[PDB]
């Protein structure tokens, strides 16, 4: 279980960055704003 709790290196930063763009995208702000507007405002 030592490997499961070992500190991460600088290479894992790109893995963390991945799965973020995968779920957000480059135009996430506009889509989220429009969806919230249509839903509530």
Swiss-Prot record:
Subcellular location field: Nucleus
Function: DNA-dependent RNA polymerase catalyzes the transcription of DNA into RNA using the four ribonucleoside triphosphates as substrates. Second largest component of RNA polymerases II which synthesizes mRNA precursors and many functional non-coding RNAs. Proposed to contribute to the polymerase catalytic activity and forms the polymerase active center together with the largest subunit. Pol II is the central component of the basal RNA polymerase II transcription machinery.
Subunit comment: Component of the RNA polymerase II (Pol II) complex consisting of 12 subunits.
Family, as annotated: Belongs to the RNA polymerase beta chain family.
Miscellaneous comment as given in the Swiss-Prot or TrEMBL entry: The binding of ribonucleoside triphosphate to the RNA polymerase II transcribing complex probably involves a two-step mechanism. The initial binding seems to occur at the entry (E) site and involves a magnesium ion coordinated by three conserved aspartate residues of the two largest RNA Pol II subunits. Present with 18700 molecules/cell in log phase SD medium.
Protein name (Swiss-Prot/TrEMBL): DNA-directed RNA polymerase II subunit RPB2
Gene: RPB2
